[PDB]
Design a protein around this ligand. Structure first.
Ligand SMILES: Cc1cn([C@H]2CC[C@@H](COP(=O)(O)OP(=O)(O)OP(=O)(O)O)O2)c(=O)[nH]c1=O
Ligand code: SF4
Ligand SMILES: [Mg+2]
Ligand SMILES: [Mg+2]
Ligand SMILES: [Zn+2]
Length: 1004
DNA sequence: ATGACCATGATTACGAATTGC
DNA sequence: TTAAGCAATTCGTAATCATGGTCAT
């Protein structure tokens, strides 16, 4: 519509006289045509965009998936005619798939056995899918030519064809490529299959693949398209694609690095009133809307389709709805004009990521950056709803329209549909703001450029594929082949680290903190630890290597060789990763905005996970190339290093050498040692910690380096891997209040515990007044016992698991929700609940907070007092006031049994005899709120009731007026379903409580 | 009369969750 | 066909084991 299509390249164009330099985004292998280049037909399409905005479909042609096998050590194997007869037999076996066989000189990645290279047969195939068969035969024994490979030789260099091409040519994902002058060609308009402005093809040996450093580090003007849908379903049921139509589709298409999107459209099902600042396309039937949205996607040519819960709800619902409406022309909204976009259900499983079930869609040529998955992977939040996330990062608890009323807003006037459209537009613009604040695209681009994987791998693949790609690249650059070691079944665990005993107590003395700079990567790159340096006793005896100069032995007992024999490739990969992390931390150093500070911290934190993921992959039994020797060696080195630094810092800083006190290693967490020098001064403690870290780094190998990071003036060591204190990096002002492992920074504890622990630690460490902290704890206990705590602060969230042997509360809750509502949280979702009161097991006492808010069922206050708040508060206040004095304040001296508006099986048809006040005398036959015995207090109880009513009515007015201000509307009703707003769960509670207190005041 | 048997705390074990490096 | 590692704490539920209250004897 004169504003959607990209800029058309100059019409004075030709396959010559122009160099199409473009930054690829997507890579996909597919057959090209009946023609064959380099004796093969399959190609790798590189969907990208140039520096101006012209979408390119560079076809890389003429690459055959080669397979490395050990050349047979037979006399008749170096013969040319024998190789010819063997390749003829191979062709006759699978009907002419193999192309040729190149005898190369290459060495294995496994172990060092001299600088000699073995003869390796590099077998080509016309189409790559043959290798998976061919390789398999070489490991089963289904090939017998002169009984060469009948026993089964271990194959080598097993990877997919796309990554194979990218590794051979050097095309790291999201990098810059360039087609030289005229060497490429352009596909005829009667054979172009994509909707791109270009459709070219070039043999792989001609193009130049630029690195992502220097002149070729910039990005391309990507057309990011954020979108959302809104569907009006039947009453009391979840939206299903068979009966509940899509009523609105909002699209907020923008550009990478742009401060504002260039279009805001709302494809509506009926006539929609105009919305200032956005376009509106109002249709008549749903088929027309779907077809026009498809044509709109095709027209705009978006490089990325970002959104929230798009891969799981939006796009699958749209596809299934188009299928149900017999719109057979909808699912072709990819960069290819003939292939379908279909839903394939995959399952991801990882220890650090949890089991998830994703419904992926094959949207070709366009990246996908579903913000839900990106935030589940990068950040650890209590809830992962759009409202909770928008309140966490952006910080706005805006209104979320009720779901049941949607069916009555679409069936109304045009202004009802207009406000529906503005809701949809806000929902569709939220993911753009999220991606711009979190810097998702920049971080993931840096990641895909350092590791060298396709962008799409960062969301559907773990940390193994990155180290795999890095290893393959470094191997290709060093003439080495990676064997296809069959992954072992499993293992229980190997020996990790040796966490030092945590001397508990309260430490007002400044505790310095000295930790290692990337301990495990430093250990790896410091001792020449890799796959290619792993010798054994037989090897060193056969080669006659000198000890401590040519080869070394690790504390685990394994053998390696010094850098004088062979430089590993894991050291090089780790050098690359730490040089990336150095600049990622320098950028954080040169940055002021606290939100951008946290973003750069997350960026740095993801570059030290991969540097640790190298060691994790070397130790990962489940996965290719599991070399437990190297992981065990680095763990042994780390243990011995922390023990040695503990000994050294306890030895040098003592009385004899001329120091004031005796330095004591208070705590150690496998890389850090929190030495206590004794000096109550803080600046002196910082200087001594710096000097100690420097002296310790003096006693280690070059890549290793200990650094003074922080100091804890008030230090509260609760237990092992659990403590808190004040962060003092400067002797003039504390930075923050740390809480490691405590129940506050956890997620399976109600937010009330977090708030209480934060306030208590603030009063104890910052202000140093334990009396006020104890008074606040007593007030909190009284609030809990008297039902004075909001439901929103009593919500516990737990991550659901696929299978459960021992029943859990959230699992049974999800099952009951599925049986009752109609749909429940699948695996991987954080189910939230509150613990209602009852008699049966705890897993049978858990309910949806909305069900509790609706049914007014009481909350188990004693459970939250004793099981949720008692233990953490006790553990944090006992090192100050003793155990018994701390536990005494948790006795239940007061209770409030609600028994109100709970009409059910028995709580209905029951009376309230309305006993007397302030004495509860049942002899209240005489009317009035007081009995004749205690009538002298008739002037105080009325004061109490009236002031309770005053506070309640003030709070009620504030809350409801605030709700109206938030809803933007004053003359309309605010039916808001947003349960992530602190005022939610509270307005209704205050309304009920004020109703009861007013009815109690009406007795006088 | 003497243990028998049922009911009620200690103790151990392991699943489940989350966080710490 | 695909998935970094381990160390550590905390809580819930069951299984098992010591010990007492009361009864046929
Ligand atoms: C966080 C994390 C850590 N590890 C291991 C690996 C070694 C130690 C050191 O970890 P640390 O976070 O303190 O940080 P560190 O790199 O040592 O140091 P600096 O910030 O560079 O100073 O922990 C891991 O395997 N997976 C992880 O996700
Ligand atoms: S509870 Fe109030 S502030 Fe929160 S979303 Fe609803 S109307 Fe807005
Ligand atoms: Mg560290
Ligand atoms: Mg640490
Ligand atoms: Zn009375």
């Amino acid at each position: 519509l004169s504003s959607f299509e990209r800029k058309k390249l100059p019409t004075d164009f030709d396959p010559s006289l122009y160099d199409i330099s473009f930054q690829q985004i997507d890579a996909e292998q597919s057959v090209l045509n009946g023609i064959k280049d380099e004796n093969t037909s399959t190609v790798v399409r590189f969907f990208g965009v140039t520096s101006e905005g012209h979408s390119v479909l560079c076809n890389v042609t003429g690459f055959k998936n080669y397979l490395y096998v050990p050349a047979p050590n037979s006399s008749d194997a170096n013969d040319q005619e024998q190789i010819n007869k063997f390749v003829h037999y191979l062709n006759e076996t699978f009907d002419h798939a193999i192309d040729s066989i190149e005898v190369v000189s290459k060495q294995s990645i496994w172990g060092y056995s001299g600088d000699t290279k073995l003869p390796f047969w590099k077998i080509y195939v016309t189409y790559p899918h043959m290798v998976n068969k061919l390789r398999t035969a070489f490991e089963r024994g289904h090939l017998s030519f002169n009984s060469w490979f009948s026993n089964g030789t271990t194959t080598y260099d097993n990877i997919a064809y796309t990554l194979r091409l990218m590794v051979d040519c050097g095309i790291v994902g999201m990098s810059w490529i360039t087609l030289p002058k005229g060497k490429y060609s352009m596909i005829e308009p009667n054979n172009r299959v994509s909707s791109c402005q270009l459709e070219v093809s070039i043999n792989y040996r001609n193009l130049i693949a630029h690195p992502a450093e220097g002149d070729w580090s910039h990005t391309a003007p990507l057309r990011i398209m954020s979108f959302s849908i809104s569907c009006a379903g039947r009453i009391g049921v979840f939206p299903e694609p068979e009966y509940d139509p899509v009523i609105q589709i909002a699209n907020v298409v923008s550009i990478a690095g742009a401060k504002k999107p260039f279009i805001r459209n709302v494809f509506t099902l009926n006539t929609c009133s105009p919305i200032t600042g956005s376009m509106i396309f109002s249709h008549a039937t749903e088929e027309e809307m779907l077809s026009n949205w498809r044509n709109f996607i095709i027209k705009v040519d978006p490089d990325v389709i970002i959104g929230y819960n798009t891969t799981n709800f939006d796009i699958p619902y749209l596809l299934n709805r188009a299928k149900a409406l017999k719109v057979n022309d909808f699912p072709y909204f990819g960069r290819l004009k003939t292939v379908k976009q279909e839903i394939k259900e995959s399952v991801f499983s990882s220890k650090a990521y949890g089991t998830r079930e994703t419904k992926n869609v094959n949207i070709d040529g366009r990246l996908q950056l579903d913000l839900l998955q990106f935030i589940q992977r990068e950040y650890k939040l209590r809830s992962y709803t759009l409202n909770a996330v928008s309140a966490h990062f952006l910080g706005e608890q805006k209104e979320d329209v009720h779901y049941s009323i949607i069916s009555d807003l679409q069936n109304g006037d045009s202004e009802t549909r207009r406000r529906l459209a503005v809701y949809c537009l806000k929902d569709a613009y939220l993911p753009l703001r999220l991606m711009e604040k979190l810097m998702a695209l920049v971080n993931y681009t840096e990641m895909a450029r350092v590791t060298g994987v396709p962008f799409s791998y960062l969301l559907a693949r773990g940390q193994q594929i990155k180290v795999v790609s890095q290893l393959f690249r470094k191997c290709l650059e060093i003439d080495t082949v990676i064997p296809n070691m069959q992954s072992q079944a499993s293992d229980d665990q190997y020996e990790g680290a040796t966490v030092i005993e945590p001397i508990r107590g309260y430490y007002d003395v400044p505790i310095a903190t000295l930790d290692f700079n990337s301990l495990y990567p430093s250990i790896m790159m410091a001792h020449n630890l890799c796959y290619t340096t792993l010798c054994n006793k037989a090897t060193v005896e056969r080669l006659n290597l000198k000890i401590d100069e040519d080869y070394v032995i690790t504390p685990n007992g394994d053998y390696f060789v010094t850098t004088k024999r062979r430089r590993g490739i894991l050291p090089i990969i780790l050098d690359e990763l730490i040089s990336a992390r150095k600049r990622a931390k320098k950028d954080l150093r040169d940055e002021k905005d606290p939100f951008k500070r946290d973003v750069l911290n997350g960026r740095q934190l993801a570059l030290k996970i991969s540097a640790n993921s190298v060691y994790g992959f070397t130790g990962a039994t489940v996965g290719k190339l599991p070399c437990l020797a190297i992981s065990s060696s680095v763990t042994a080195y780390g243990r011995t290093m922390i023990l040695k630094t503990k000994t050294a810092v306890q030895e040098k800083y003592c009385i004899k050498n001329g120091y004031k006190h005796d330095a004591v290693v208070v705590y150690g967490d496998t890389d850090s040692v929190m030495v206590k020098f004794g000096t109550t001064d803080l600046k002196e403690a910082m200087d001594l910690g710096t000097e100690a870290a420097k002296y310790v780094s003096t006693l280690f190998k070059h890549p290793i380096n200990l650094e003074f990071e922080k100091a804890y003036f008030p230090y509260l060591l609760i237990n092992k891997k659990r403590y808190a204190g004040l962060f003092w990096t400067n002797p003039d002002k504390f930075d923050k209040l740390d809480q490691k492992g405590l129940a506050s920074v956890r997620r399976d504890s109600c937010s009330l515990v977090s708030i209480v622990m934060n306030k208590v630690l603030k009063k104890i460490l910052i202000e140093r007044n334990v009396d006020g902290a104890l008074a606040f704890v007593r007030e909190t206990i009284n609030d809990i016992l008297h039902n004075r705590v909001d439901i929103s602060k009593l919500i516990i969230s737990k991550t659901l698991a696929p299978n459960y042997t021992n029943p859990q509360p959230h699992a049974v809750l999800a099952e009951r929700m599925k049986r009752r509502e109609g749909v429940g949280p699948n695996v991987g979702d954080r189910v939230d609940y509150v613990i209602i009161g009852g008699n049966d097991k705890l897993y049978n006492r858990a309910e949806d907070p909305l069900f509790v808010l609706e049914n007014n069922i009481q909350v188990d206050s004693r459970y939250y007092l004793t099981n949720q708040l008692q233990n953490p508060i006790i553990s944090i206040v006992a090192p100050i006031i003793g155990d018994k004095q701390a536990n005494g304040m948790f006795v239940v001296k007061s209770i409030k049994i609600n028994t109100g508006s709970q009409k059910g099986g028995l709580m209905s048809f029951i009376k309230k005899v309305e006993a007397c006040k302030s004495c509860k005398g049942p002899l209240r036959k005489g009317e009035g709120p007081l009995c004749s015995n205690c009538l002298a207090r008739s002037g105080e109880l009325y004061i109490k009731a009236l002031y309770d009513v005053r506070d309640l009515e003030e709070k009620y007015s504030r809350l409801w007026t605030q709700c109206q201000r938030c809803a933007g509307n004053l003359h309309s009703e605010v039916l808001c379903s947003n349960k992530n707003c602190d005022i939610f769960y509270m307005r209704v509670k205050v309304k009920k409580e004020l109703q009861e207190k007013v009815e109690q005041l009406s007795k006088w």
